[PDB]
């Protein structure tokens, strides 16, 4: 499916997207990985997201630095940290989207 933003750093990709429901985002998240994340580090890019100073879509939770333990896995190549957020955006009388906006961050291999 299509998604919104894609921003990498040659170690991890912080992505920004949307899916049809609790299903295609589940298909997509299953196709990657599932992780128990623990000690997160806060860094000046998070606040540049709170500042709006690095353009993105602030439905999104922030962050991109942590330590990851595998729960489940489908691609041997990708370590998804977690479905950072997901919110079904309904729209209005001017128009729909109705779908589930979401955000994920994932470090690949190698």
């Amino acid at each position: 499916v299509w998604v919104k933003t894609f921003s990498e750093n040659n170690n991890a990709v912080s992505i920004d997207g949307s899916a049809v429901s609790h299903d295609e985002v589940a298909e997509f998240m299953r196709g990657l990985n599932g992780v128990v994340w623990t000690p997160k580090g806060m860094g000046r890019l998070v606040d540049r997201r709170r500042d709006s100073k690095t353009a993105r879509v602030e439905m999104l939770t922030s962050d991109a630095t942590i330590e990851e333990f595998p729960e489940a896995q489908v691609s041997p190549f990708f370590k998804n940290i977690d479905l950072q957020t997901a919110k079904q955006v309904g729209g209005a009388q001017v128009g729909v989207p109705i779908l589930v906006e979401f955000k994920i961050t994932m470090t690949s291999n190698y």
Binding site: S21, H22, A26, M29, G34, V35, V36, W37, T38, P39, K40, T61, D63, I66, E71, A72, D82, L83, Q84, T85, A86, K87, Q88, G90, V100
Partner: protein, 86 residues
């Protein structure tokens, strides 16, 4: 289905009947608020969507409930409604 999925049911809140949501039925919406793992909330949803009663789940949301983000945890708020008569 929340308990057997492992989720903490932090709040169940009934709705108001939708007096203009149908000529032949008053829809009562129920907003449910459960926390746990992504696998477990997908599970909770699919079980409610496999029930033998009229709980049509629609607009879903969930997010990471930990401020500092030091452990995985997803608070989830699902909206699901049944359709009484008028």
């Amino acid at each position: 289905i929340g308990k057997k999925s492992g989720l903490e049911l932090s709040s169940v809140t009934p709705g108001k009947e939708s007096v203009g949501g149908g000529e032949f039925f008053a829809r009562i919406p129920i907003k449910m608020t459960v926390s746990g793992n992504y696998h477990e909330i997908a599970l909770f949803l699919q079980e409610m969507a496999n029930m033998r009663r009229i709980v049509n789940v629609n607009n879903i949301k969930f997010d990471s409930a930990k401020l500092k983000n030091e452990k995985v945890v997803l608070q989830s708020e699902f909206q699901a409604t049944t359709f009484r008569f008028v």
